[PDB]
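#dry-run=false #mode=assembly
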Amino acid sequence: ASRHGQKGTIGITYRREDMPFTAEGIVPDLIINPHAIPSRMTVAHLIECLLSKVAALSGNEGDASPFTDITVEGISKLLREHGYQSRGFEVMYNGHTGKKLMAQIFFGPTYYQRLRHMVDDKIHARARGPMQVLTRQPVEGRSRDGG
Amino acid sequence: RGNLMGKRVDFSARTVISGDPNLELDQVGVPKSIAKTLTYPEVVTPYNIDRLTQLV
Amino acid sequence: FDMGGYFIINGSEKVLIAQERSAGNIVQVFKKAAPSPISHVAEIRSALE
Amino acid sequence: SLHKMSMMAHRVKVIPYSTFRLNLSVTSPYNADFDGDEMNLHVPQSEETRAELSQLCAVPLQIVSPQSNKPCMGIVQDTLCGIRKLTLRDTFIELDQVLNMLYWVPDWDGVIPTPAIIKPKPLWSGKQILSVAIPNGIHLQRFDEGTTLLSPKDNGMLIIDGQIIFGVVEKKTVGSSNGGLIHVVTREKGPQVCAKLFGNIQKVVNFWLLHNGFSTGIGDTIADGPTMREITETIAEAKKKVLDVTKEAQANLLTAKHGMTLRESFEDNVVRFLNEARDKAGRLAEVNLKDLNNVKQMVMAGSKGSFINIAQMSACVGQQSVEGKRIAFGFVDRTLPHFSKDDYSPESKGFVENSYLRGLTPQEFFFHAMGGREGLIDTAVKTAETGYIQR
Amino acid sequence: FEDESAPITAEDSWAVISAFFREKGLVSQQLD
Amino acid sequence: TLSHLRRTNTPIKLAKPRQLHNTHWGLVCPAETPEGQACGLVKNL
Amino acid sequence: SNTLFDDIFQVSEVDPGRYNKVCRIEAASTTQDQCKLTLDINVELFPVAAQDSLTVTIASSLNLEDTPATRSWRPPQAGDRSLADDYDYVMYGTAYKFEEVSKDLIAVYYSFGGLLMRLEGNYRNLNNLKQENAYLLIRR
Amino acid sequence: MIVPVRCFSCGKVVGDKWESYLNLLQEDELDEGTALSRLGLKRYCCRRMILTHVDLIEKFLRYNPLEKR
Amino acid sequence: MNAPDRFELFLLGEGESKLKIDPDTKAPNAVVITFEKEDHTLGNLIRAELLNDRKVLFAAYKVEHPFFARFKLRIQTTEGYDPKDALKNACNSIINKLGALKTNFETEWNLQTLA
Amino acid sequence: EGPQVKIREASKDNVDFILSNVDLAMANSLRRVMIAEIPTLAIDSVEVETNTTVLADEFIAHRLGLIPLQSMDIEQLEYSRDCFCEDHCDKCSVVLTLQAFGESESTTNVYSKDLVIVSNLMGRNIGHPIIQDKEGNGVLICKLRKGQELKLTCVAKKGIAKEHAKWGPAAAIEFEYDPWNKLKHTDYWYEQDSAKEWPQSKNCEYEDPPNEGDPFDYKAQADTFYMNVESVGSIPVDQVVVRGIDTLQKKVASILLALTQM
Amino acid sequence: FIVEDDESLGHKELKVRKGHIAKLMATEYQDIDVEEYTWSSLLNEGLVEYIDAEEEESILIAMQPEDLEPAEDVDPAKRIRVSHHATTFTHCEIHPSMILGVAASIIPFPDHNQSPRNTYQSAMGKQAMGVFLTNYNVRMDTMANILYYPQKPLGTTRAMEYLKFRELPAGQNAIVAIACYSGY
RNA sequence: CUAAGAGUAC
Ligand SMILES: [Mg+2]
Ligand SMILES: [Zn+2]
Ligand SMILES: [Zn+2]
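#status=ok
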């Protein structure tokens, strides 16, 4: 999950050669769906991605405090000075064919947390197993091979 | 309510779900470990003697 | 970096959650519902420390 | 599992990873996401149970729901957005990509359709390739607002014999809506053909969107300078009207609407003015957004988002309300200790004039937090009560 | 800066906050 | 750990304790509370 | 094979609309005073401006020989001869409506993969058009 | 914990530039951006690899060894 | 737990071959070739080199599922032209072009002095 | 005759060149092969004899696997899977040993220069950890407080980046074509003016800008790709490119051989 | 902060001035010889005050000093703020960002988000995996989870350097693309 | 094993 309530599980993993790449050879660590943005209105996610890109380029640290006078306009100007599109878009190329993607991709660093919920601690199946002594029904819980 | 209208059952699995645009509408992807755990009893018939013997 | 503020009971770290309550020695007046014969009630939960 | 569609029979496909995998279209009846949701699987243990599971609870047999006599599954999320982008008049596809997309359809009969443009360069249109997925013999005709037999706006929909004659394919056509393509196909050719149609449309549109790309960024929430100035002017005019109504009420010249008190009428007028102000500013911002705007594209396709989302992200978040009223005087006659007593101005009682792009002032941030808290509390109470009522 | 009695700026208040967190800490209420 | 060490619980009248009150400004976090049954009852300093 | 229709039109308007590669043009026949045309054209692939004279033809096939799509399209081999060799902009579409505008005027609607065309004129020369597939050939 | 051997995104070896980076920050009084540029980190993937690292191993080294030889 | 071994991406398993050809019944003179332990890197190249051929009516490929490293390639040629022959010609052309490119790059590199 | 190459810059670790008269598919396949398919040497197995450090055993094993190793003569090494030895031998592996002790009162840094090759390289040019910085110390494997010890033995096999990214010798590969967007393969997102808002690429100087009046060229294809290949250090960058081309050619040749044999 | 008449400037002003800030800075730098100046010194000299909800009913608070104390062409990108048109303040907020708690202080740009998203992140950051203590190697806890390479955020708040988040981070800076790449 | 409690996921 990001720091804006944008939780999600890994759908699939692609190796580097299959990921989309920019003209500089940079490939994303993560790809998230655009459709997560409009309904949830997590603008701070986008602003933080832009600020992180600027900070990584310039070597400073982005001041993402809430009620400061930091605007997307200034971050965009700083990003433009560094030689990138001011709004964070980058011309990417499809990994499979190497062709330019007709649409430009929002691209940049973002801080993500690994949450404690892993699938290997949740997967559980039971054909037959221990039965409860009273009701002669399957026991409860995956720690007990329950049903 | 707790043991007659609804009760814990065997031959059931549970886990996290993921999307797959490459699966049909009526298809479900099943982990190999779960498929190896859950079982179905097939009666031995002249029509399925060979494959059941192979599975055994 | 450990900040303390917890106890060690039988080797387990135990923290006391701050319990919220209504303050004492304060007069509070409340309107009652229509069916009840009393319309307003002014009460104090008197206590001495 | 609130309804019978939340429990359906699927066909096993053994896969080498530790999660259940399911089609994107079937997530709507299950009300399932992929943000940590878990699902349960039951294996029938006899030929009778197996057979009735396959013949009564199968997913294709559930496509049209008895709940509202309309399909419950449709095209959603990326594919939906993709299909809207694929069926535009501008979209043209070259020979190699056409061959790929045709081969991606499992039941394609093996004949390459004649390109829509033959000279000077063989080009296929998006509608032409998409019509390969639609089964042969399907007819559909929907007339949107203002569409004629010629479509200047390319809206509406005309499909003849399984070929899209005109209209941009979007939610009204391939969504879970009555009279749409899903409904027509399932009622004409049967559930199996409708499931196959789901698969074909998903495959082709997903391939095209893979090799076309779609994104969204911060720049998609930005309106140009003149539009921002007009939005500010609209907000200022609304605040002036609120101030005028406040002056009339303070002068006691305001007359109470029949059936309500003076204060109730004043609150109604103020809330109406602020709501229509937010609506007008959002409409200005939406009009300003270009057809290349990605949030606009997602709204137009209907895959995600709405006009209010655009208005709140770009123009104005709007009036925050708790229990259907403006923010109450939690302190003695004032909402916060940063305001004077008896301040009924829009900013005092929870009007957020800033958009999410601009950011919220501390007071607006707190008032928005109060609104969100009310939403969460309502969610919890609602789920408990509705569960009991449903039982 | 040079003037000792000059009014502070919004940037200066963080110094004050730092002093607070130097004397109090995060769990001051429990220990107190 | 830091959040746990600054947690307040309200045992559960005709009031509406789950709402974020105006008086909560600057004393408890405007947005930090469980989504479950404890929403609003469990607060953080 | 044979041209079901042919004429020369003058373009009075070109409307880009919301598109970047496609424009809708209204044209009036230079000979007949009652034949008019509305057509969507891939202007990127074939630029068109106002007051441009376009020779417009509708045919049932492109092969020079007479008629003896249901057959899979194939790339044009080197040395293939077709009617399209005589024109600059060729589309393939289907008729989907035959409207009776008036007692004498009829209109025929064609769709080339979503590019719409409406040809209106007296029925005495539009009679050859029927509900089928047709090639639209244009030369400047 | 300790500086990663390679950049996560592109795979450039950055595990041999931590000491040089600290030396540049301390001895030469360069700001972070110029030091990163001097070390040869031009893509911002590598720049975030080295710029955001937190060297926790130092703290781990303060505790006395459990098995001391 | 359920993750497959990474060497299954490029190592042929027991009892399977690199190529298998199945005649296609949808259209005449067409085949579908399944390539095992391969991915886009080979498929896109082969398909494009096939599309450069003048006697190839149809050429396409698809990777049906990312989980498995295999892809299907449909080839249809004009009458009297074996699709296997088309595949052979495409492969030979690719090898010739790569050899020429290797020679050119070696010659260009040898011309350098600052390396 | 064939694809033409003209290289702008050459270095020890970067080569910037232009690849003209070639298809887009061929350039992309070459890029993918360079990323993923080139064999390389890296530490695969770790036997830990003593670890009193503050880092976990598999933590250090992971770090060691990521150490770049000389792979110039990797073609003379065999894969462990198709070698007739039992676990590992001299024909398919290189054995290194790390032995560090904290004898100093200050922190002692365990670098990759401390790795010692124990197996007989038989005259090959593989195994040596790659040293790039001026100080001569390689990657910073670990740190030792006084009294702490770390003794371990690594076995390094040859592998490709597909099996694990630690075998990738390619780092980042810049790849661009058609800087002026004359092929119209992208639709530039913009607010007021696309040309002003999109900074020009450095390769725009190598092509003629569009005339702003000419009609769209619908027959032009994509060629003249500007590619910049970086090297991790395992093999020289020119060898990276040459071996990528060789690997792609070998793949196609294997396809031909299988087709002929069946 | 306490606000008084300050007749010298003729208008309300904070009791705290640059000299006290300088002394606090000097003490902090010495900790990282002058007379120690701590928070208790600010408290004793009547510079800051403790206010509870009951006393907060009878005061007026300025949100920020620089914009609300002094008596009254603007950047269109900045958010709209109101001067309140009132000069009778009794106190000033030390910093508005201090209304947030420990978990909410980690959110970057929390004022550019929908409030339920902030609540979700506040709940979900406690489940973030990082380094809970530096002595995890000598504690026999029932369960412990540690990142190999914790990274401090590229976008960071001022309040999170009192929470030691940069010293004990619970996440990583991943290169993220927002794209409909494969439908997965 | 049983019971009670707490935290948590959707
Ligand atoms: Mg969910
Ligand atoms: Zn990097
Ligand atoms: Zn061996």
